[PDB]
Design a protein around this ligand. Sequence first.
Ligand code: HEM
Ligand code: HEM
Ligand SMILES: [O]
Ligand SMILES: [O]
Lengths: 153, 153
Amino acid sequence: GLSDGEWQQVLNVWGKVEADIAGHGQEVLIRLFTGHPETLEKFDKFKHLKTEAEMKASEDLKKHGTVVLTALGGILKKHAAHEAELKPLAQSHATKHKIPIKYLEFISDAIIHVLHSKHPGDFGADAQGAMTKALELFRNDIAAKYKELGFQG
Amino acid sequence: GLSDGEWQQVLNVWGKVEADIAGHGQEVLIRLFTGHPETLEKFDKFKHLKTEAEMKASEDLKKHGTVVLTALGGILKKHAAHEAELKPLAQSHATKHKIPIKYLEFISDAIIHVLHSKHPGDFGADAQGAMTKALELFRNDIAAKYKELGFQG
Ligand code: HEM
Ligand code: HEM
Ligand SMILES: [O]
Ligand SMILES: [O]
């Protein structure tokens, strides 16, 4: 996993990408296609482009570069933002409070119980399934941070 | 994993939690402490509160319930946001484009090289280490979605 400082380094450099996303995207795809030609064969749209000149001249390759780095920038930002809320909670619950994963399972079950009790008409079996899975992913995320911090949960 | 509709169900029910967060937080901790009395022993401020009545009268237990459901709500929303961008990418790249994880490693190499080439002043050894780890976590997240979809590589 990344520290807070490491995430800030990632977001700082992504700021530079966004100032010329089209140029960054083009250079990334040309570097990829030239180093690993089998990757170009996956693009039915582009595999006819032989020369670096033809790749640089392609409107669509340049537009696709922008699509790729736009999507990746959004994933990295949303990852960083989830980390910024998960990390402090995992830190206190591992090091200060020392809360076992089983206790996190108990409060997860309590939350599902209370939502079923307060919203019986709305919180049906499907919605309950959704919340059960989301709280399991939450517990797994905490457990992975516990491990990194060397707390046996 | 959760489907798109399942994530929306999680967000919808959290809106109902936030409409009476005091009541929800109280009832969650009461359900936890009454169902699993060993969990009360973790709370120096609360562990003397044995009955549901004593717990319901505690202004501090009610405030702590709100702190818990506020923290959890923020983490679920940030998780949903990351999933909303990761899921469609894993879906197309598994089912339509059929992109092996190794090819994601190749484009990750190209990204790091282009960032180092264009922005050496903002892409030192540490920052490069940070981006290498972030892109590996991205690949791992896609690989986990590939597995759910039963696509190997
Ligand atoms: C950082 C890594 C990557 C990102 C963020 C990314 C993102 C995207 C996005 C947003 C699209 C358009 C929407 C979609 O179909 O899902 C796309 C299309 C596509 N990607 Fe990727 N991609 C990545 C890596 C790769 C790699 C390594 C390959 C192949 C070697 C690949 C092959 C394709 C293909 C063939 C399409 C369809 C393009 C078209 O015909 O217009 N992707 N990608
Ligand atoms: C959804 C699960 C949980 C969430 C979101 C959560 C969140 C929080 C937050 C935000 C705090 C205050 C800030 C902090 O110290 O990190 C806190 C404190 C605490 N939590 Fe949790 N918590 C959870 C589960 C648990 C469980 C299951 C236990 C024990 C069985 C526990 C025990 C504590 C304790 C002892 C404190 C310190 C209380 C004080 O002295 O004021 N937590 N929790
Ligand atoms: O792509
Ligand atoms: O908590």
